Amino acid sequence: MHSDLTFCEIILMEMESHDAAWPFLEPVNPRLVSGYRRIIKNPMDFSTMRHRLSRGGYTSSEEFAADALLVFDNCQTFNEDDSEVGKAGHIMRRFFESRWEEFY
Numbered sequence: 001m002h003s004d005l006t007f008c009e010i011i012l013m014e015m016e017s018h019d020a021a022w023p024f025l026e027p028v029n030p031r032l033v034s035g036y037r038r039i040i041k042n043p044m045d046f047s048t049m050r051h052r053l054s055r056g057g058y059t060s061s062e063e064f065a066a067d068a069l070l071v072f073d074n075c076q077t078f079n080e081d082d083s084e085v086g087k088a089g090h091i092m093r094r095f096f097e098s099r100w101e102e103f104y
């Protein structure tokens with residue numbers, strides 16, 4: 001438990017500070033992104049994960065990883081792989097995956 005959640009802190013801090021994290025530090029504003037609400041059923045972002053981590057809302061590290069994967073699934077759902085947001089999501093996705101297995 002304590003082991004599970006301290007890893008998520010480390011990972012989330014390192015994603016928050018990553019160069020390629022700029023598209024995911026705050027929720028997408030659907031007023032600014034035509035089509036987002038229609039296409040992305042379950043939005044997610046790093047600060048939503050931060051807020052949920054801060055109040056203890058993650059019971060296990062598997063839930064935390066589920067939210068992280070959703071960030072990048074939504075990203076690949078909405079943005080082309082060769083777009084600027086797409087390219088950053090791939091970098092962030094691979095960062096998370098490699099950092100995740102460096103514990104589990």
Ligand SMILES: CCc1c(-c2csc(N3CCNCC3)n2)[nH]c(C)c1C(C)=O
Binds near residue numbers: 022033036075
């Ligand atoms: C293409 C829009 C988009 C962004 C995005 C673009 S610019 C930005 N910001 C930079 C820092 N200032 C605040 C906001 N975010 N991010 C995601 C996950 C998007 C989509 C739809 O998937």
Ligand SMILES: [Mg+2]
Binds near residue numbers: 097
């Ligand atoms: Mg892999």
